[PDB]
């Protein structure tokens, strides 16, 4: 089987800059008919791959001319000039000259944009969940950049590290930001044993964390 | 404008088997190879095999030679992929796509997410998340929806039945203690809520459950 080696694994690129993705085949991939079936696909999380370049350098219908493919032998390159926000996702090279057809490991293109602070919102347990006997406190850290971010939970001024579930969205295809959701789960009794709940977001956009809190028995 | 129709997801037990469909409408279906591709997470996809509906005929990758069988139903323009002796390593997304002409895979189905597990199906608990009681109104407001303790994936969460899509952030589900949990936030101007209705709709096919939760001030 033809091994398709693709590099780099991750590619952070500034809007407007040029992106260059490499792919090397373990062997010649020129079909007997003289055609090299080397293709490049772009896939957004949760969606099916989309064909961009075929036959090494031909652009599929509807693909912007800033996308360019080149190469021969065992080395191929996909270049994206003037990267735009919508170019995000994972790129895969592919060879269909030899059976079985094989794909490269993929290159995740991350769009670099200006720094942006998160918009933080905290949510106390819903009355319905309390009736159930549980108590989850939710904190949303939305539309920030870069992706590196930290959340710390505090109960009556004291840090709480157990019972936390964090989840990051995939980079936004329009504004290039990220969002993160942090949930602190407790028992209803534990929740009612304290009053002040806090999530603190530490992001490079500020020396001091963005603090959001509430008192359980207050309105 | 061809369209490959695939089922969104499916769950199966270890040792069992499944038969996933793909309906090729639009036209042709006879003069085009149909391929099945596997993808775990965001790894490079993996070719399983193909079948030529027109004159029959199939090719399978050695790796799936003994595990997969591709068949077709010309009257319904549908290709099937039979996977047997299912194990946890068969948990992934399976796409059907077509090859033909100067390029391979120009059209794809949405892909079918298959989960192989012996664990039992658990409907999720859906909790509406309104802002902190009595918090100071800002020009915008962020509401939330927490979907906790369900199995298997996936659930389909929408706001106002899909009508409200901008300002939405649905976070990837996370597995903790054998059960999945996910959340979603939606941000709108304070003149939109609570003045107008905003509801979280959660569908969980595995358990045939469809729940709606209105969000109102605490
Ligand atoms: Cl307790």
User: What HEC string does chain B produce?
Assistant: CCCEEECCEEEECCCCCEEEEEEECCCCCCCCEEEEEEECCCCCCEEEEEECCCCCCEEECHHHCCCEEEEEECCCCEEEEEECCCCHHHCEEEEEEEECCCCEEEEECCCEEEEECCCCCECCEEEEECCCCCCCCCCEEEEEEEEEEEECCCCEEEEHHHCECCCEEECCCEEECCEEEEEEEEEEECCCCCCCCCEEEEEEHHHCEEEEEECCCC
Resolution of the solved structure (Å): 2.3
∠ CA B131-B135-B136, rounded to 5°: 125
The structure tokens listed for A55 are: 């036959």
Length of chain B: 218
Residue B150 forms beta bridges with which residues?
B180
Nearest by CB to B110, from A48, A102, A126: name it.
A48
- Experimentally, the structure was elucidated by X-ray
Q: Which long-range contacts (CB under 8 A, 24 or more apart) does B18-22 make?
A: B18/B82, B18/B83, B18/B86, B18/B114, B19/B80, B19/B81, B19/B82, B20/B80, B20/B81, B20/B83, B20/B94, B20/B112, B20/B114, B21/B78, B21/B79, B21/B80, B22/B78, B22/B79, B22/B80, B22/B81, B22/B96, B22/B109
**Cα–Cα dist A53/A66, whole Å:** 11
d(CA B59, CA B49): 5
| Spans of all domains in chain A | 1-113, 114-219
From B108, B144, B170, residue closest to A49, measured CB to CB: B108
- State both tokens at B192: 């939109």
Are residues B183 and A104, on separate chains, in Cβ contact within 8 Å? no
Partner A contacted by B162 (CB < 8 A):
no
> Alpha-carbon torsion A60, B7, B167, A118, what sign?
negative
Domains of chain B in sequence order: 1-118 (2.60.40.10), 119-218 (2.60.40.10)
Give yes or no on whether A1-113 and A114-219 have one common fold. Answer: yes
Q: State which H helix or E strand residue A69 sits in.
A: strand A67-72
Give A-chain residues touching B99 at CB under 8 angstroms. 96
Which residues make Cβ contacts (< 8 Å) with residue B217, sequence separation at least 6?
B130, B131, B133, B194
CA distance A144 to A115: 7
Both structure tokens of A153: 């939970």
CA A66 to chain CA centroid, Å, is 23
CA dist., res. A26 & res. A23, Å (int): 10
Cis peptide before B158 (omega within 30 of 0): no
Spatial distance between the Cα atoms of B147 and B149, rounded to a whole number of angstroms:
7
Shortest CA gap B119–chain A (Å): 22
In this structure, which topology does domain A114-219 adopt according to CATH?
Immunoglobulin-like (2.60.40)
Measured at the CA of B51, the angle between CA B49 and CA B57, to 5 degrees, comes to: 115
3-class secondary-structure state, position A192: helix
B18 is written with which tokens? 């499944």
What is the C-alpha R_g of chain A? 24
* CATH 3.20.190.10 for the A1-113 domain, yes or no: no
Residue A26 is classified by DSSP as: S
Burial code of B73-101, b = ≥16 C-beta within 10 A, e = fewer?
A: eeeebbbbbebeebeeebbbbbbbbbbee
Three-class secondary structure of residue A1 per DSSP: coil
Residue with tokens 């323009």: B77
Residue list, CB under 5 A from ion ligand 1: A 187, 189-190
Residue A206's nearest CA partner among A115, A120, A130, A85 is A115
A103 and chain B: CB distance < 8 Å anywhere? yes
């Amino acid at each position: 089987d033809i091994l398709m080696t693709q590099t780099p694994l991750s590619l952070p690129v500034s809007l407007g800059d040029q992106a260059s993705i490499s792919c090397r085949s373990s062997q010649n991939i020129v079909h007997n008919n003289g055609i090299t079936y080397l293709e490049w696909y772009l896939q957004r999380p949760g969606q099916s791959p989309k064909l961009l370049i075929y036959k090494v350098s031909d652009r599929f219908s509807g693909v912007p001319d800033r996308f360019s493919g080149s190469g021969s032998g065992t080395d191929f390159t996909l270049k994206i000039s003037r990267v735009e926000a919508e170019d995000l996702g994972i790129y895969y090279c592919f060879q269909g000259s030899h059976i079985p057809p094989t794909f490269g490991g993929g290159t995740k293109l991350e769009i670099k944009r200006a720094d942006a602070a998160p918009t933080v919102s905290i949510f106390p347990p819903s009355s319905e969940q309390l009736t159930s006997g549980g108590a989850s406190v939710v904190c949303f850290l939305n539309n920030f950049y870069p992706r590196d971010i930290n959340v710390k939970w505090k109960i009556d001024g004291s840090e709480r590290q157990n019972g936390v579930l964090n989840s990051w969205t995939d980079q936004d295809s329009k504004d290039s930001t990220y969002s993160m959701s942090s949930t602190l789960t407790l028992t209803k009794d534990e929740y009612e044993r304290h009053n002040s709940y806090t999530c603190e977001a530490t992001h490079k956009t500020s020396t001091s964390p963005i603090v959001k809190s509430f008192n359980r028995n207050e309105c | 404008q061809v369209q490959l129709q695939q089922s969104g997801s499916e769950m199966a037990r270890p040792g069992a088997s499944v038969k996933l469909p793909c309906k090729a409408s639009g036209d042709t279906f006879t003069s085009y190879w149909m391929h099945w591709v596997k993808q775990r997470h965001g790894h490079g996809p993996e070719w399983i095999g193909n079948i030529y509906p027109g004159s029959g005929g199939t090719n399978y990758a050695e790796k799936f030679k003994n595990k997969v069988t591709l068949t077709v139903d010309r009257s319904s323009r549908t290709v099937y992929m039979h996977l047997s002796r299912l194990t946890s390593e068969d948990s992934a997304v399976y796409y059907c796509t077509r090859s033909g002409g100067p390029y391979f895979f120009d059209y794809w189905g949405q892909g079918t997410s298959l989960t192989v597990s012996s664990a039992k199906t658990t409907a999720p608990s859906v909790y509406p998340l309104a802002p902190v009681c009595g918090d100071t109104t800002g020009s915008s407001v962020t509401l939330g929806c927490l979907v906790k303790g369900y199995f298997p994936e996936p659930v389909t969460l929408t706001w106002n039945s899909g009508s409200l899509s901008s300002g939405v952030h649905t976070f990837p589900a996370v597995l903790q203690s054998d059960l999945y949990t996910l959340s979603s936030s939606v941000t709108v101007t304070s003149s939109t809520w609570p003045s107008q209705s905003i509801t979280c709709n959660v569908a969980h096919p595995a358990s045939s459950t469809k729940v709606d939760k209105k969000i109102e001030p605490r």
